């Protein structure tokens, strides 16, 4: 009853490990992921401001070809 338990129970220890280590290794990616979650939000900031910027560009674009005909 003990010889197997003096074999099986100690073996149970390190058969947690590598897969569980892989879990802490896989969640090391999560260490970035629960941290790099906000990268979209900061990305979501410029997607409009540049869109707001290119609107001025678009607004300035009219300033470009329109002066062509008027000066002509």
């Amino acid at each position, epitope marked *: 009853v003990m010889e197997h338990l003096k074999a099986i129970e100690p073996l149970i220890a390190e058969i947690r490990g590598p897969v569980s280590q892989e879990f802490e290794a896989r969640r*090391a*990616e999560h*260490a*970035e992921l629960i941290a790099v979650r906000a990268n979209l939000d900061q990305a979501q900031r410029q997607i409009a401001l540049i869109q707001a910027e290119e609107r001025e560009v678009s607004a300035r674009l009219a300033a470009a070809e329109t002066a062509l005909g008027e000066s002509d």
Partner: nanobody
Amino acid sequence: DSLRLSCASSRSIDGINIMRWYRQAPGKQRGMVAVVTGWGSTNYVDSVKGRFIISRDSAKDTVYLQMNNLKPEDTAVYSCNAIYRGSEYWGQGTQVTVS
């Protein structure tokens, strides 16, 4: 005598930070033996003074060494290591004979 070590590389060549070798003597944990860096400075662990020499390629990304002038403690399993972005990566790890 002469038996080399080759620690090859199939992905992500040399765009690496510091990389390392481990060995694990029987009934013990693992630890550094010899490392190189992006700066490629050569340093080791005292047990191999003048008895390990470490090197680096850009192309192959496969450190080499020397293993002789041998000691009965040299019977162990040798390995490698590398690390990125806050994550570490082991290697395979292989056996070694002193006789």
